[PDB]
Amino acid sequence: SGYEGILLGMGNPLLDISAVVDEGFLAKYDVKPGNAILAEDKHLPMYDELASKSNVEYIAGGATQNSIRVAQWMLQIPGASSYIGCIGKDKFGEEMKKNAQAAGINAHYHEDENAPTGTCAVCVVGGERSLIANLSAANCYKSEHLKKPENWALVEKAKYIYIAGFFLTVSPDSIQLVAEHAAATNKVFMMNLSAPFICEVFRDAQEKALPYVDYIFGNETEARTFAKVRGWETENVEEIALKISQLPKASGTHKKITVITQGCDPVVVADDGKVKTFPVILLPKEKLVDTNGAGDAFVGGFLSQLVQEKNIDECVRAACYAANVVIQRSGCTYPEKPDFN
Ligand SMILES: Nc1ncnc2c1ncn2[C@@H]1O[C@H](COP(=O)(O)OP(=O)(O)OP(=O)(O)OP(=O)(O)OP(=O)(O)OC[C@H]2O[C@@H](n3cnc4c(N)ncnc43)[C@H](O)[C@@H]2O)[C@@H](O)[C@H]1O
Ligand SMILES: [Cl-]
Ligand SMILES: [Cl-]
């Protein structure tokens, strides 16, 4: 088939350890609700504390893995997706390999000899979660691994390449190597803003990669964080989307299209100097089960139609379908086959 390995993702493969907790649990580990952070030494016993709970759920996660997973599911073409990351030689790493084969992703996972597979605590309070990412083996990815002929073949075969902003903490040099290849080969390189701490702490790494980005995705909060960091005196998402697209580009082959989600409010898309708003699928609060992986599934649905050379209206329509499905189910899960027509 023509779509063989047409979409590649590179990131942090993390097994999510999710559980419903109370206010005291977050106060114990000093974690703010509805915010993502990287794990510190004080947060490490929390993983064993969550593992001991009766309501603990284990699901193969990681922002880029989730988006590639949802794109392959929406697309339904066998062998169309590829993924690159680092895992440990342990039970969680074998679960990561098992899940990727079931999902239909050609995941070339580099197995580190000493580090365990990365985990991510998803502490849930009401309808807001705190993510504490312990990258462990995921943080061991080197440009040396990407340059291996087995891994670099996936970069060359791909036409569309996606990397969540989270991977900028692990290897900005590996990101830059595939980004420079995509500019030189007129391919579609794309990224996510991922979290406010990526825009604030990793501002230099993100700024260096952005000129190579053809489709930048994000939510309203991380777009406002991005605007405040660059001194733009504006909170309006519509003005911020045009200002991001307006930034310099390493290659003028493609324009930069900025897609910003606003939860239940319309999707804002800056494209060729014009702002296009798209209302989302109306959903009652009783059916809204969990907003976990809503942003990652939105990117996945968008990528499924972008791969088939479809217009931006159909990319956003599939992005809303995929996110709508995921929010009505626990975590980033979906039915056997998609019903997008
Ligand atoms: N360091 C690290 N490295 C790698 N991975 C890491 C990591 N740290 C964490 N991760 C991974 O991250 C994952 C958890 O991420 P998670 O916290 O779930 O992020 P997300 O998937 O982006 O979900 P959010 O709740 O943040 O949504 P959003 O604000 O982006 O989107 P919006 O609400 O605008 O909504 C988007 C769309 O949803 C739909 N939608 C949302 N709300 C509604 C509504 N009320 N009604 C209708 N449609 C809605 C719409 O279509 C809308 O456009 C885990 O797998 C974990 O492993
Ligand atoms: Cl990632
Ligand atoms: Cl319990």
Residue numbers in the entry: 4 to 344
The article reads:
Adenosine undergoes ATP-dependent phosphorylation catalyzed by adenosine kinase (ADK). We discovered that maize and moss enzymes can form dimers upon increasing protein concentration, setting them apart from the monomeric human and protozoal ADKs. Structural and kinetic analyses revealed a catalytically inactive unique dimer.
Structural comparison between ZmADK2 (open state) and the closed state of both ZmADK3 and PpADK1 reveals that AP5A (or Ado) binding induced a rigid-body motion of the smaller domain towards the large domain, resulting in the closed conformation. Two helices, α1 and α2, shift by up to 12 Å to shield the Ado site from the solvent. The electron density map of the bisubstrate analog AP5A in ZmADK3 is very well defined. The ligand binds in the groove between the large and small domains. The N1 and N3 atoms of the purine ring are H-bonded to the side chain of Asn15 and the main chain nitrogen atom of Ala66, respectively. Both O2' and O3' atoms of the ribose moiety bind to the side chain of Asp19. The γ-phosphate in AP5A forms a hydrogen bond with the OG1 atom of Thr294 and the side chain of Arg132.
